[PDB]
Structures are given as C-alpha cells and as structure tokens.
Amino acid sequence: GHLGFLPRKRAASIRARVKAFPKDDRSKPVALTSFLGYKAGMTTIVRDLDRPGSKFHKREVVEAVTVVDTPPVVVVGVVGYVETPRGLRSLTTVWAEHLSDEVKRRFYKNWYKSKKKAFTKYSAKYAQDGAGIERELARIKKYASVVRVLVHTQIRKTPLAQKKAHLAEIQLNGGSISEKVDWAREHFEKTVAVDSVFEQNEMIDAIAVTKGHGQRGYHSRTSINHKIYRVGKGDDEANGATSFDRTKKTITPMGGFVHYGEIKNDFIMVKGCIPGNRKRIVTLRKSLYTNTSRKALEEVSLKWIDTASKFGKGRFQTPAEKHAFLKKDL
Amino acid sequence: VEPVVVIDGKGHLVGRLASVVAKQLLNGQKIVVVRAEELNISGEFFRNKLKYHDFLRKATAFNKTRGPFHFRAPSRIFYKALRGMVSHKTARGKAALERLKVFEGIPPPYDKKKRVVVPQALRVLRLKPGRKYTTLGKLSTSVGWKYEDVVAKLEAKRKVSSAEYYAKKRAFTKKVASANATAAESDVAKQLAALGY
RNA sequence: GGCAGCCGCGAAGCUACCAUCCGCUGGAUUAUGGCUGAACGCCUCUAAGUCAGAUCCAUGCUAGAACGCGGUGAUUUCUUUGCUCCACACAAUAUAGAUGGAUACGAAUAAGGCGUCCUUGUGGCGUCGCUGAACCAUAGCAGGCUAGCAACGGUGCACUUGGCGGAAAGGCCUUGGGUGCUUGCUGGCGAAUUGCAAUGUCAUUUUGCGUGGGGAUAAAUCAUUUGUAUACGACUUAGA
RNA sequence: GCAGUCAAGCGGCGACAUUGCUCAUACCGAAGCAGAAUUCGGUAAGCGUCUACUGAU
RNA sequence: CGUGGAGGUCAGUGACGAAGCCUAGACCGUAAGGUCGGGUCGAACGGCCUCUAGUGAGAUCUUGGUGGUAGUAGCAGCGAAACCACAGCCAAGGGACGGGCUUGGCAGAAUCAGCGGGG
RNA sequence: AUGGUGAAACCAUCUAGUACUGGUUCCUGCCGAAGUUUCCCUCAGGAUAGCAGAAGCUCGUAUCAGUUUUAUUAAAAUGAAGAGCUUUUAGUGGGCCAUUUUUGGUAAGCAGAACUGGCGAUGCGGGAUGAACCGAACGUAGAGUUAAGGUGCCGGAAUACACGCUCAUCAGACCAAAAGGUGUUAGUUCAUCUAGACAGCCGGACGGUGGCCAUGGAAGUCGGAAUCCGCUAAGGAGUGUGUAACAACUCACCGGCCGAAUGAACUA
RNA sequence: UUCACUGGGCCAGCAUCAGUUUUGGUGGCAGGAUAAAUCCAUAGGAAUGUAGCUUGCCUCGGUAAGUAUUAUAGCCUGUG
Secondary structure: OOOOOOOOOOOOOOOOOOOOOOOOOOOOOOOOOOOEEEEEEEEEEEEEEOOOOOOOOEEEEEEEEEEEEEOEEEEEEEEEEOOOOOEEEEEEEOOOOOOOOHHHHHHOOOOOOOOOOOOOOHHHHOOOOOOHHHHHHHHHHHHHOOOEEEEEEOOOOOOOOOOOOEEEEEEEEEEOOHHHHHHHHHHHOOOOOOOHHOOOOOOOEEEOOOOOOOOOOOEOOOOOOOEEEEEEOOOOOOOOOOOOOOOOOOOOOOOOOEEEOOOOOOOEEEEOOOOOOOOOEEEEEEEOOOOOOOHHHHHOOEEOOOOOOOOOOOOOOOOOOHOOOOOOOO | OEEEEEEEEEOEEEEHHHHHHHHHHHHOOOEEEEEEHHHHHEHHHHHHHHHHHHHOOOOOOOOOOOOOOOOOOHHHHHHHHHOOOOOOOOOHHHHHHHHHHEOOOOOOOOOHHOEEEHHHEEEHHHOOOOEEEHHHHHHHOOOOOOHHHHHHHHHHHOOOOOHHHHHHHHHHHHHHHHHHHHHHHHHOOOOOOOOOO
C-alpha cells in the first residue's frame, strides 16, 4: 500500500479543513481564497479542444464534469493570527452580533431541548458606538499579520435536512492588512458569491472526505489541479445553455440528482471527479500557487452539457422536449 | 545568590554551557536559558551537521514511535545535551530538570530582566582564534527547523525598543553622574573617601 | 401466482486495467567546472574568501500529544438561595525548600564602553576595564509612644490623567492632589524574669465552613429518529 | 605454483619491476568521440532483466 | 536452642482460668529461640540435674484443602479442564546463557475486535 | 519361580530383590585440605606417600627455615621455644589460565614434554558489565591516611599549573599498515652563498653541421651506431612544444636587474 | 499525709583535661662554592655600539651608514 496515507484510520470529521492556503500577495486587491459547497452529482459535457499540438486539436471531446452546489456565503466574523516561535496563534475573534439560527445551531447538539441562549452578552456589546468591538478589532490590525475570515454556508438554501450551517475559516490575501480587516468590516452580516472568488478556466483544488464502505473509506483527500469550466448563476435562468446552442436549459437533470435535490443557487462545474459522495461538503482552494501550463491556460468553448435523468436511460434534456414522446390523461 | 538565573546562550558552547547548568540544577539553583538559537558548537558546519544525522539514524530500527524522536528546535537540542548530563528516570533527576527553562530569543518577562553569561563557557574564551565553529541556527534549520525566520524577524523588534530604554537610562545616568559629581568634595563626600566609599 | 421452476428487458446493490480525473516547487549542496590568492616573489578551484552545479532539507498531502497548546459563547436558584467575583474569620493540605533586591541595550573579541567637540565620519580629544570584593538598599519592640529643626525632596497605601508592552502581552512606566513614615538633623520615655542558646514560630500553592457587598441565572448524555455511517462498538442528522 | 638474474634498501636478507611452461537509468572526466551509436572511470546504489500490526472504548 | 516420653526435684503453675491459636504491643539472647501484655479459649501444664528417641521449603514426594485459568469453553440458568517459580519492549556490551546484569531509549491507569504473523 | 485366575493376560508371595537421577530437616565458634607420587598393566579397585586432625615419648631449643656466602659439608647474618620419633585416620585422583626450558611447521594457527605462579574453596574497591585484569586475604563499631582508579555532568574529587603536539567528511580517547599524501612539527647527512644562495623577468643559447645511414623528408626533436669538435660566458650531433620538411618558442648551460639564506635525501 | 531539697530518667551548652587525628601562625639552629646572587670595588672586552664626531639627507635638522669602549645610557668577563 501507499505509505503516504497510512495508517488508514478514521477522518477527523465529516468536514475537511484546509491545511494550507495560497502563500501571499501583498500587492493585489483583497479577495477571498476559498469557498464551500456540496457534491451535486455529476454530468457529462462536450467541447472543442483548442489545445495546440494535440491529437484531438479542434475536435470534440467528451469528459465527465462534476457539479458542486455553492450557495452564497455570509461572514459571521474574522480571526487574527500572529507569528510565534511555536507557530501561528489565534489572537482574538469577533462576531457580527446577529449570528443566524443555523450558526447558533452549530454550537448545540440538543438544539430543541436547549434554551437556545446563544451569543447574548457579546450581542449586548454592540449597545454602544463599538468601543469594545472596535478595540478588539484594533489590536488585530495593530498586531495580527495574517487574517482569516469566519464564514458559514447558507444551509437553509440547500435541499438538505440538516439546517446546521457548516462553519470554517478562510484565509485572506492582500497588502496593507489594515485594508484586509477593513474589508471584513464591510462584509459583516453580508453575503459573498463564488463569482467574486473564482472565474472560468481557473485552476483549483478541492478537499473532502471519501465515500465510506461500512476498514475502508472515510478519509480526507486533497486531489489537486482541478479545472473550473463554468461558474453559473443558478438563481438566473439559462444557466445550462451555451453560446452556440442558445436554447434555455437548466443544469439540473430531469428528476434532479441521485440522493440530492434541485439546484437553486450558484454552482461551479469542475473537471474530473471531486472526492466525496453526494451530500458531502467540499472546500475549494485555488491551486496553492500560480500554476503556469498550457493545459491550465487553455480556455473552454463549452458546447453542450448533459442534463438527462440518471435514474435509468435518458432520452430528453427537458420536459418541453418530451412533448415529442396519452390514455391516462386524454 | 540569585533566585532565578537567566543565562544568554549566545556565544556559548553547548557542552560547556550544559555541563555548568546541569550541576547547578542538581544543586537546587533554578536557571533559565535564552537566545538558544544563537548557541554555538565547536567545529565547522559539516562535522556538526554530519554527526546530527548519524544520531538520527540509530533512533529505532523497527519503529520510531516506539522509541525516541528527534526535536528540531535549537532549545530541544540543548535540552537533549543537558538531559544526558542529568540522572533522568529518577526523582532527583526529574525534579532537577523541572527547574530549567529554555526558549529561543528572549520571550517576556525575561526581556525586562537582567541576563548573565558563564565566563568559563564562552566561545571567545575557549575556542582557539582562527578556528571554525558552528551555530545552532544554521544547524537547526538544516535539520528541519521552520522558525528561524520568525525568531530573527521578531528578535529585531526585541533589539529595537531596548536601545531606547538604554538611551533613556543612559541620559538618566548622565544626570545622576552630574548630580553626584557636583555633590562630590563635600564634607560628607570627603569623609566617605576616607572609609573607602 | 395460492403452491415450485424457467425465460426477454430491467434498475439498485455487490463491484473492475473491465471504465474517467489527478499526482509540486524553492533552498543547503557532493562529485564537477571556475573567479579571486598564498602556502613557495612563478604556478595552483583552497588553505583564508566566492559563483554555478543531483544527496539532504524545505513546499504540499496523510495522522494529530489517554497526561501538547491558543481564541470564542454559554456555564444550573427560588434544587430550602444552588453557582461564582471581592474584604477578612477560623481551620485545615502541603512547600526538590524566601529568610534584603533575577540590578533589562546592541554589537566586536587581531576590539569596545562613558563624557566632550565639529570635520557628523570606519573623525579628533579625555578616560574605564585586568571582574559583581560591584550598585541600590540597610539604624527604630521582627523595629514602639512622643517634641522640634531644615527641606518640599525620598518613599509605603488607596484614588486618578496619560502612554507603552501580543513571544508566553497578565506587566512596565507618567500629570494631579489625599494620607502615613522619613534615621537629613537635635531631643523626652519602654525594652528586663525567653533567667547562658534551642528556626523560638513573622512567607508560599490549594480547599471548606462563615458572614458582608456584587453578577449571571445552561448545557451534554440516555430516549425518539436517522444514514453522507455502520462487522459489534462508534460516529453524523431532525424535534417545545 | 616451481625455478633464475638484478636490486630501493635492511644488515648475509630483500618490495615492484624480472626470465623459463602453465551493466538498461541519470550527472560529470578521458577516448580519431566528424554525426549516430560506444567503451572506460567516478557519483546516486537510484533502477531492472507473549508479542508486531490494526479496528474500537 | 527446641520436641515425644521417663527418674528426681520446685510440699511448682492451674476453673478468681493450664493447654493451643492471633497480635501495625513490649523485653531478652549475634543465633537456634525464651519471656511478658491483650483477645480467644476450656482442664491440664511448666522451671532445673539426669535418662531416653519413630526428635527439628524443595526429592516430576504422599494425604487433605484452597487460588488464577473462569463466570471462560460448554449445554436466560447451570458451569470445567490443560497449565501456572516470577515477569514476559527495543540497539549494543554481557567472554561460553540471555528473560533478570550494564550503557541509552521506552511504558497508560483501564479496556477490546480483526489480518491470523508467529505458537 | 511358585500357586490360581479368563479364553470370540491377569492376581498373592519369595521380594522392602538387584544401583545410577533426585532428596537428605536446628543454631554458634574453632580448625580445615586435596585435587596427585609407588606395582598389580589403564578402562575396573583398593593398598601405600602427601595435604589436615588426636594421644604418648623425648627435647626447648646447635631444633631448624620455600631466606643471604666461602667449601669440597664446618661456619657467619636474619627469624622462631611452634623442633624430632613413632602410634592412627575423615575428605582427596577435575583440572583451567598465564610464565618459562623447549622440540615439531604449514597459509594458518599452534600442538606437544616438563617447571613456576593466579583460580579451583573467595568476599572488597577500580576496570562503564564481564573466569584468568590492578590493589587488597573479611569478627561488630567510631575516628584519620591510603592501594589501584579518578577529579566537565551522571560521579564523591582541581573547567589546576607548566611545556609542546592535531583538524580528522564516524579524528583522538578501543593487526592486513610495507608504503602513499603540494598534511603538520623538530632534527640527521650533503650542495651553494655578499666571487651575489632560491625564485621572478630579459639577453646569449654558436662553427664544423642540413654530423653518418635508411628515403619524396628527419635540417637536434618519426627512425639505427657514434655522440666527435673550436671558440666561448655557457651551450646537449640537442629536454620538450612545434612543421609535410624548414622555421619559431623553451631547458641545461651561462650572463644582466634584483637581494640571504636557499636546495636535495632521510629520521622521529 | 503536705510540700520542699536531693536521687532518679530525655536532649544539650560551657571551662579545663587524657588518647587518636586534621589544618594554620611564629621563633632558634647545622650544612651548600661556610649556598649561589645582589651590592660595594677593581683591570680589561665588544655590540642587539651609549655619549661625542662625519657621509647623503626630505620629515620641520631628520634619519640610515660609519668612527667611536662609557663619555650627557649600560652590559659581560677576570680578581677582592
């Protein structure tokens, strides 16, 4: 076996935490470095390969592309870190005073039985001009060197019975850390979209926990170098259409996905197969560095995406097309 | 004489410094070591670096976890040298080791307190002039230490704001010297010189 | 199909080189090629110095110290007022071991400290080391009760303005007045019988019971249920 | 192996010379290495013809 | 030094308590052992000179009893056997035997299922 | 063996028969060895001699000694009453290591005859632990000095002093080594030297002669024997580079400018 | 029978003693080449040449080369 992963013991948790983030960029504008989502099944795409010097240059190619459900993300707070001889240490953390019920549930196991006495004294800390809150934020600006944002997924927007928002840290980048923490100041209680953190043709890597097998499975993996093809605004219409097809379609296949519901929010189409089965949370990171290769730089002229039911053999991409198929009705 | 002795490891020999400190530990004297990353070892870099790798080989033939493991921090390297000079696995040895503290640089509150050096363990006073020597900083980094940059970076901040403290102290002592100088030759001052003070 | 069987399609499930995706980027370098230059007025890649250049370390991934660590929210009443913060009231548990003060620049060691000057520099002048045998502090019943002199400084304590310290900041400094001492100086009384000494008891970490004054006043597990899990354990869902 | 000359020296013995029969990979340095292919030398020894462990509390 | 019994001796001790046993109570002797105090106990026993002998940790020892194995294997309820000096982690030195010695490093209090690796 | 038992070996006595594995029971003190020499040949076994005890006799000492020297065994020094004769009586026959005389020998080692010491019955300190190594031969105690070993910690004791010595890319503290190394340090024997030692630059570096022979060619420098000669200041029918052969550069050999110790082989 | 002295038992302090033993201070003596030195003299000598003087001479009268045995420093040897 591969000793790089042994011992093959249990994963730390269902959620996988990003162990490393992009190094630094003290000149580019402040922006996020990661995102969260869920495994929304898989689909198939056909595109023309514009790769020069290839055996299939300008020819159509079929490849399985995974779709990740990435509903907008809202910032609940920020974390400051300071370099120490014993490693990075968390200096102080702050909150937005209005943590959603989904976040409040994350701190309780018997939520129904609990009195639901979530952040109350800290919430009362906002009863003035922010002297207490600002002072804690000021020391982070004065002392902290790297700033990580505390954000959670809008679980209520996903077809999941959980309703328990997943909470994890995302590292920021940019110079003049004073601006970085100031950026978080504006985004308190505000939401962020994948379009502001990723773009088409960008290279990213995803980390998740593999499917179990009832000693097998249930391990964290970080399959690197996954290409983003399309970042669709799921809330808008014609998300599944293409420039050279111009027919209104939705990425959601007829009958939805296996063990997953419909998609009604932002999503990302990623090359390959991100580890983790359906309903598994996946964290997205961008390449850990400035990868430079022809494969990474090549753009994709998307032609058509398969959106047929997977519960058997599909025939049509939409019920409207099914009209070219009735006693039980008329 | 001093309840807690703070020793600056800069410019000292690990073997000589460890042996001197080890005896004091067995004598009930508490000692704290600072700036261990700047500690030096005799011989050029290759010999010291080569010897460390040889020791790492013999950790354990079958399972490192069921055995010893190699600490990369410079303080741990000094601790390992001092540990072998103390009767470990005994109540007296274990208790004595509890009196010793080692840190890289000068973490507080030791930064605000006086630090001493061992004259019989300085490289200048022991190593022959012109001979090569090795510094723990390079040796520690070569064996996987990942905090040399952090220690060096924040140590300058320690060096800064300390000259300012001395600058204020130096100016204050100048006023004291002037006040003492003008008060000299008085009846009390003249009589004091008779008794040697 | 009630009974026991096979056939055509057919999921799901088991489940594979029998199919798809992915598999990184910087340093110290050896060998080796050189620059500078003695050993030895030539020479030399080497002795003092230095560049390029594969093995080692770093980047990344996996696991994460039954007794590694940091940040954050909540933290139980009328449970006969439970919990906790603060002042002391008595007790206990013990002290890898107080019995004046851990008194803070940095850098070099074939060179540096302190004062001064202008020519603000690898500058001139004066002087210090050769140990801390130092500096501060140190007198009063284990440090009392009182009267004056001279300074208005020194200092213990509580208020209070402002600033600095995030590496383990948990501390370090300053404006203001208040209240004690001031042995800086001169005076008035007590010390005893602990009987010739017995550490002759003068601090430190923890806890309970008590008052008096403040503050907040909840969760996990079992249960139901569930599967992204599951050999059995275990673990992940949902609810007034 | 046996036999024989000579001797740098050791103090009469005697080194070497002496006569008779009996890697496929990668990086460096040399090779009449024009190119390709190749041998030789070095480096990496890389690369090929009751208890160990592991699940769980 | 101690024990079984015997002659003599202490006109010996003893139901107001002799023997035996227990004692984190004490004393004596370097020793075999002797003495005292307390608890238990219920009818015999001891100081000294001699006589006498079936007279004082192991033998894969005999008899009888009791532990782990084990509330396990096995047929909710019942309920064994083999075995047991003691423990049973590594590199090296331990001369010829490393499982106890030495130089260093280790070890979880506690509990438990599989690949079977050995047996 | 005796006497019976059952028919698809057993029972009771002679017999507790006949001997190498195992065990062999309380305390203290004193003394206390051996481990092999004589024939029956040795495998078999005692009898004797010895080590250690017990009584008697004689004698305390010219009684000797694991001691030092003449002589051909007197006697002189040291030590001691521990001397002598029988009489009798438990255990004892393994030997290992080292030393020495030493013969034998081939890859080797060493084997083997005998002698003297340590162990064999033995604690203590050091040797990091260790048969046979170093000192030291033991009643229970207090005080002080030492043997061997050590004095940076474990580890009780000076990170003492003085003189030198070494950079080793596992040093050093633990016989295959004759030789190699432009590593280091101190010496031994010779050569030159203010008539200029070494080195660094410049000049000269010649005539016969293109010496004789192979031959397209060897003019000093692909090759074969001489390797002669005159002047010189010193120059080889030429030490290398170099050409098809010439040519040209250089050393070995002197000279000019420099300014003192330098060069060659060996020992440790 | 009551204290009020001693004896009686535990641990020690001080003064001077006797044995063993450790570590300091100081004094009087015999030997050396009747210590050797140093010192005081005395006659000579050169040099890692002192004073004085002379050959070029910038660095302001500076030196590096001479002569010169004590002179406006000293040293060694021989003898008392």
